[PDB]
Amino acid sequence: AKPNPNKQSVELNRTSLYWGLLLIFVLAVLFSSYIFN
């Protein structure tokens, strides 16, 4: 009916982007070395 009154917009700044990229790549390093066996 009427527009949903629970509308929100997500956000992510450059610091969060850098932290996420670093976490992803470090986890990839460690667990790729362990998964390749």
Partner: peptide, 30 residues
């Protein structure tokens, strides 16, 4: 084959570090 993957992972991490250092969002005093 896996050596290429290891080197790519290390190089990507170093590039992320470089970009984080030299392309950061500058702090601004309110």
């Amino acid at each position: 084959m896996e050596a290429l993957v290891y080197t790519f992972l290390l190089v990507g991490t170093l590039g992320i570090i470089f970009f984080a250092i030299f392309f950061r969002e500058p702090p601004r005093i309110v």
